[PDB]
Design a protein around this ligand. Structure first.
Ligand code: HEM
Ligand code: NAG
Ligand code: NAG
Ligand code: MG
Length: 225
């Protein structure tokens, strides 16, 4: 009850969380025809994300619809390389190697190795993201990261801490994050509960700044902020 894997005509994204919300039915289970109202309602219902942040994210999502000026998106639209989808994902391979939409065990094994305790803090999240950037740059001859892709990468690490975890301590249990990625199901059984405080654009901004502040390069190699 409450969760179903995708079937052959369902579409999924490179986003572990939208995929999770489609699997649960917060978003349409076939991943299609997502409007601004469905986004607001789904992200508010499942996660207590506020309307303004839901609206901002929807605005970006709509840009990936191949129809111009679209009022909806489908989850597979989000997989279009170098619009929102970017290299040096935590759990997906770069498009250069293979499809950048589905979970990739090799890549996620790398990310997990930088999550060094049972509680993920801002330092571990920043560290895991950095090694993905450097690893893609040195292994992918087509490696790219746009100013928008960089902002998204930083915000994705901020998101799993603040939306799945405790945005005030800026910590999240590692098992919860691993479960979300590996199952695209919410880790309710491991203790996750929908937060009572809405998650805002300013919350995401605050955690994003913390991520950048936890980066200690002697000299930044390329697009790291
Ligand atoms: C309408 C809302 C959203 C849209 C349009 C969106 C879109 C995306 C896209 C396009 C990616 C792929 C970027 C890449 O190449 O890694 C992504 C990744 C991600 N998203 Fe979402 N997302 C949304 C909401 C959420 C929420 C609510 C969370 C909460 C935890 C979330 C967490 C993440 C994480 C952690 C990743 C990184 C995956 C990885 O690096 O393997 N997203 N999202
Ligand atoms: C990922 O790590 C697991 C856990 O040790 C291992 O069994 C698996 O083969 C690894 N996968 C890759 C592709 O490295
Ligand atoms: C990849 O690394 C080089 C440093 O060799 C840097 O000039 C380049 O900006 C990096 N690319 C990205 C997209 O960060
Ligand atoms: Mg990617």
């Amino acid at each position: 009850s409450g969760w179903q894997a995708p079937g052959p005509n369902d579409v999924r994204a490179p986003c572990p969380m939208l995929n999770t919300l489609a699997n649960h039915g917060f978003l349409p289970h076939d991943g299609k025809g997502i409007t601004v109202n469905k986004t607001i309602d789904a992200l508010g219902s499942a996660l207590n994300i506020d309307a303004n942040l839901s609206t901002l994210l929807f605005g970006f999502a709509a840009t990936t619809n191949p129809q111009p000026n679209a009022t909806f998106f489908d989850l597979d639209h989000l997989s279009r390389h170098n619009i929102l989808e970017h290299d040096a994902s935590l759990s997906r391979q770069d498009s250069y190697f293979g499809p950048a939409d589905v979970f990739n065990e090799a890549v996620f094994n790398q990310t997990k190795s930088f999550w060094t305790g049972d509680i993920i803090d801002v330092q571990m999240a920043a560290n895991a993201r950095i090694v993905r950037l450097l690893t893609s740059n040195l292994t992918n001859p087509e490696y790219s990261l746009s100013d928008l892709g960089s902002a998204f990468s930083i915000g994705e690490s901020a998101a799993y801490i603040g939306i799945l975890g405790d945005k005030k301590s800026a910590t999240v249990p590692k098992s919860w994050v691993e479960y979300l990625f590996e199952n695209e199901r919410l880790p309710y059984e491991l203790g996750f509960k929908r937060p009572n405080d809405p998650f805002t654009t300013d919350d995401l901004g605050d955690l994003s700044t913390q991520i950048i502040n936890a980066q200690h390069f002697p000299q930044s190699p390329g697009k790291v902020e």
